[PDB]
């Protein structure tokens, strides 16, 4: 699995479950093309977005639908979404974990990048 996402909730001290995530890849014509999407599991994790073959070099955007998450919990949050934009596989194939820690008016994100 070369691209996985993990989302945590800093209010409840839990995984952030059922969070929608959309991944896009920047095209030759400089638009964002749909790449993959899914929702986080009970563990806050989203696996199985892509494959090593399909996940070629490029600029990727991971959009995490944080606003829907908070509204379902009764909270009107600040952000529309959290977006993580990065170049992938520029130094050969890597495995990427995109982590995000959510609060109503804040988020933090980090990457864990490993060499297969």
């Amino acid at each position: 699995c070369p691209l996985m996402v993990k989302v945590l909730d800093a209010v409840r001290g839990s995984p952030a479950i059922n969070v929608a995530v959309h991944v896009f890849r920047k095209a030759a014509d400089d638009t964002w093309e749909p790449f993959a999407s899914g929702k986080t599991s009970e563990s806050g994790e989203l696996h199985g977005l892509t494959t090593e073959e399909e996940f070629v070099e490029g600029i990727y955007k991971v959009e995490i639908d944080t606003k829907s998450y908070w509204k379902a919990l009764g909270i009107s949050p600040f952000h529309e979404h959290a977006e993580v934009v990065f170049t992938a596989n520029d130094s050969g194939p890597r495995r990427y974990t995109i982590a995000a820690l959510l609060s109503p008016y804040s988020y933090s994100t980090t990457a864990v990048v490993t060499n297969p």
Copy 2:
């Protein structure tokens, strides 16, 4: 001043100076139109981006050019930029400060919304 940005460096423990910041407002066709930009000051702050009259309700995006900042420091970054996207609302407090704390492979952002 209804919209301020503050950028800090978690590696050096300092303001993040000379970081380019672009603000966009979402148009009716759902594209992003340029709205304001500047470079952070010696204190990591960017003031004067807009005015109360111009900063009407809507969806805005603040894009912070983190990659160029790290590159200037000789350090390999992960992200192309940090994007903060939010709705401006007239119901709440009048002043938005968008703060970002930068590391090469990570950033944290918060909003401080006051009167």
Copy 3:
């Protein structure tokens, strides 16, 4: 003013007001001796804790009473407090700002060290 503290609330998007803050300096016997304290202001800031003459090199601890803050808001917190422990050094910049961004089950802290 060589030591400032700023505390922000990641739930409300605001300064964290009326948060108790205690500073301690590590003694030769390795116990913590009280040094300064106060409550954050309406802007989430606490100034005037010490002076340049008093703030000599050594190990200091800044304890932020996060639990009482959340309790006052009716929200169950995880931590008893947030502790920031560091060495003050004369070689570097003169002004330390300890910033903390608070959530019920999480906090982030950074140092901004300037002239």
Copy 4:
């Protein structure tokens, strides 16, 4: 496993390996008593600190030796350590993950708390 720690490095985008961690429990006499210690693995994780039987209610301090970590990487960091202090098992037994994301002049921490 009722108490585990995970440490990540926000400079390198990797686990924080070989990080020393000391856990203390507040005694009846209000001192900090040693409870358990270990080091993070290649995955940035520390498991096996304690057992469900031993991990009774109390106030616990997890001290993560961040300064040694950064100095080994050639960096002179701000903090002496990162300390996470919390009451455990007050609403019955729980499993706790203490996560920390490290930078030279900053850290973030969160808890993931689950009911067995």
